[PDB]
Amino acid sequence: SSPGIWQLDCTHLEGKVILVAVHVASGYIEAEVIPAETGQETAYFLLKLAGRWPVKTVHTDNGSNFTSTTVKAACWWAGIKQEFGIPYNPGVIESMNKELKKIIGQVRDQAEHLKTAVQMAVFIHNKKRGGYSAGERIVDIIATD
Amino acid sequence: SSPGIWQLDCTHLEGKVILVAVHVASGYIEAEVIPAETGQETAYFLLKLAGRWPVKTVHTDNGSNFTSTTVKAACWWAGIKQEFGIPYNPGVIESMNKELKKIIGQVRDQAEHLKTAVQMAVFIHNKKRGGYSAGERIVDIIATD
Ligand SMILES: O=C(O)c1sccc1-n1c(Cl)ccc1Cl
Ligand SMILES: O=C(O)c1sccc1-n1c(Cl)ccc1Cl
Ligand SMILES: O=C(O)c1sccc1-n1c(Cl)ccc1Cl
Ligand SMILES: O=C(O)c1sccc1-n1c(Cl)ccc1Cl
Numbered sequence: 021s022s023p024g025i026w027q028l029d030c031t032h033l034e035g036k037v038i039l040v041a042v043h044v045a046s047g048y049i050e051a052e053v054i055p056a057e058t059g060q061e062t063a064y065f066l067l068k069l070a071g072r073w074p075v076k077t078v079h080t081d082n083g084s085n086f087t088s089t090t091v092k093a094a095c096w097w098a099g100i101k102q103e104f105g106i107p108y109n110p111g112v113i114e115s116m117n118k119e120l121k122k123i124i125g126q127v128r129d130q131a132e133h134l135k136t137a138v139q140m141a142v143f144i145h146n147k148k149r150g151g152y153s154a155g156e157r158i159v160d161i162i163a164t165d
Numbered sequence: 166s167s168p169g170i171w172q173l174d175c176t177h178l179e180g181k182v183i184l185v186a187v188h189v190a191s192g193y194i195e196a197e198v199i200p201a202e203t204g205q206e207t208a209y210f211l212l213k214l215a216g217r218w219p220v221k222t223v224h225t226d227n228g229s230n231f232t233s234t235t236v237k238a239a240c241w242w243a244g245i246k247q248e249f250g251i252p253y254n255p256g257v258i259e260s261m262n263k264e265l266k267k268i269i270g271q272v273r274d275q276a277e278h279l280k281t282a283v284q285m286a287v288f289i290h291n292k293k294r295g296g297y298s299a300g301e302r303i304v305d306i307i308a309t310d
Contacts, residue, residue, distance in 0.1 A: 067288065072287075146216055155217070155218075163308035
């Protein structure tokens with residue numbers, strides 16, 4: 021709902037780790053293939069996200085993701101708080117993650133490296149379209165705000 | 166001028182390479198520390214950029230940056246053309262690059278890793294403010310378009 025809310029999770033594919041951020045209000049995605057799930061990678065991703073968009077709160081489906089000193093420090097520096105208004109469903113964000121994995125599978129054979137296929141899939145997801153695309157919606161929501 | 170125009174260049178610091186993209190109309194920046202200057206890294210950066218913003222043309226101060234088959238293929242896939250309306254000055258974009266290096270130097274001792282300091286500097290640059298910030302201007306320009 022609020023335009024400052026993002027959700028971050030990781031997904032595994034081909035023995036690699038995909039960090040997926042979803043802007044909750046728009047469905048817009050940013051993603052990165054990272055070598056392993058570590059607090060350092062999560063912290064770095066959060067700082068990059070925060071320099072690009074007005075990130076006020078962040079949610080996740082795996083709370084332990086956010087416990088390291090390194091993540092907390094990135095939080096702290098960028099003024100990011102943890103989001104507590106989205107309950108855990110033992111999910112809309114998890115569906116978009118499954119959609120993204122669907123798109124990855126559909127484009128995977130067109131790229132040599134998984135990391136390329138992920139960015140192809142993000143591009144497809146954000147530009148696909150009343151009826152606007154997620155990329156159009158995020159800029160509208162933020163500009164209006 | 167046109168909202169689809171970006172400029173990409175590399176900068177060197179501490180034996181590492183910083184790839185800097187500037188949205189020409191707004192002054193908004195995205196940057197990444199990459200291990201070396203290669204066409205693969207440039208291509209990957211361009212795909213990520215293109216999935217996030219409506220990238221129509223790209224300029225650079227080092228034309229040889231864009232000759233590899235890998236960059237051309239990323240171009241091709243994302244529908245990016247080379248920008249030919251910005252002449253080379255043997256520069257506004259080069260000033261912002263120097264501004265960013267100024268900010269990096271000012272925050273460098275607050276982070277262990279250069280890559281963190283770069284993202285701190287991008288955050289500072291994009292959020293600093295009539296009088297709007299570059300981050301505010303890019304979303305306004307794109308939303309209006
Ligand atoms: O580089 C640092 O000193 C800081 S300061 C706050 C987070 C980090 N960090 C990131 Cl981001 C990745 C690895 C580290 Cl350490
Ligand atoms: O192609 C589809 O059926 C759907 S459905 C939602 C996204 C996409 N998509 C893929 Cl996968 C590649 C290009 C597009 Cl558009
Ligand atoms: O992964 C690929 O097959 C393609 S397809 C077009 C560019 C690339 N690429 C990137 Cl992006 C980084 C390294 C490579 Cl290869
Ligand atoms: O601090 C300044 O003089 C300027 S001047 C332009 C940006 C900045 N800046 C830095 Cl460097 C850290 C925080 C800010 Cl704001």
